[PDB]
């Protein structure tokens, strides 16, 4: 979207609380060790157990699970700040860090049958087997345009900007532009537990970076993410944040 709020106190409180959670000083620093591991291993997605988040502040966990977008963004910013404080150079290397959710969820651990519309704008977990799957394509997220004539630079978030304010040519700076990979997968409820009487529920799952090759068609996967809606036909999609294989 790109729209921001100017010195939101609630967002600032969320940022401070999550940063306090990240800097495990009174504890052994389990998450701090995980931050070291991710810095060393060149991975930019930190998986945080939800049970710890409940233990430290039930209110934070509740507001997270009930309003996914703002809390997730705030916690991502907190992770960026914590990484930069521990090591600024590594933070400067990358653009934005992402956060994943694992652990145990009381009532939001649902099945495609259970995943009715009532869980809109709430973090959910879906269990099943991959059915349909698409190929790996790159999707644009920030396109940088430079105008040789007006000597100005225009950047847009997410038709494609082709003409300037006064129809001068625009040649895009590809390098400064950021492209992330994208994939569309689907899931069906487990054969043994889904009753054979009523119709099957199919849910679409969109994967961001670091998720295209983690799950492949035919495996058994758990997907956790934000259950949003795209804007005459209204279809539910699930933007995911953590994918883990199953079939032990």
């Amino acid at each position: 979207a790109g729209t921001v709020v100017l010195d939101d106190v609630e967002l600032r409180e969320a940022q401070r609380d999550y940063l306090d959670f990240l800097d495990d000083e009174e504890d052994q620093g389990i998450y701090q060790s995980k931050v070291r591991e991710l810095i060393s291993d060149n991975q930019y997605r930190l998986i945080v157990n939800v049970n710890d988040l409940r233990r430290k502040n039930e209110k934070r966990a509740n507001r997270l699970l009930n309003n996914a977008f703002e809390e997730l963004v705030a916690f991502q910013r907190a992770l960026k700040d914590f990484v930069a404080s521990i090591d600024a150079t590594y933070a400067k290397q990358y653009e934005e860090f992402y956060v994943g959710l694992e652990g145990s969820f009381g009532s939001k651990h649902v099945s495609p049958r259970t995943l009715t519309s009532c869980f809109l704008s709430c973090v959910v977990c879906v269990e099943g087997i991959v059915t349909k799957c698409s190929l790996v394509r790159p999707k644009v997220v920030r396109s940088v345009h430079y105008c040789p004539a007006t000597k100005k630079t225009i950047e847009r978030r997410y038709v494609y900007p082709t003409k300037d304010e006064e129809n001068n040519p625009l040649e895009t700076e590809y390098g400064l532009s950021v492209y992330k990979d994208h994939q569309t997968i689907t899931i069906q409820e487990m054969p043994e537990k889904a009753p054979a009487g009523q119709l099957p529920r199919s849910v679409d799952v969109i994967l961001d970076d670091d998720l295209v090759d983690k799950a492949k068609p035919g495996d058994r996967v758990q997907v956790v993410g934000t259950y949003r809606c795209l804007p005459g036909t209204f279809r539910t999609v699930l933007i995911a944040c953590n994918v883990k294989q199953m079939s032990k």
Binding site: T131, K132, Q188, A194, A196, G197, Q198, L199, P200
Partner: peptide, 8 residues
């Protein structure tokens, strides 16, 4: 006998 419909 569709790809993923098991309903009988």
């Amino acid at each position: 006998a569709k790809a993923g419909i098991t309903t009988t």
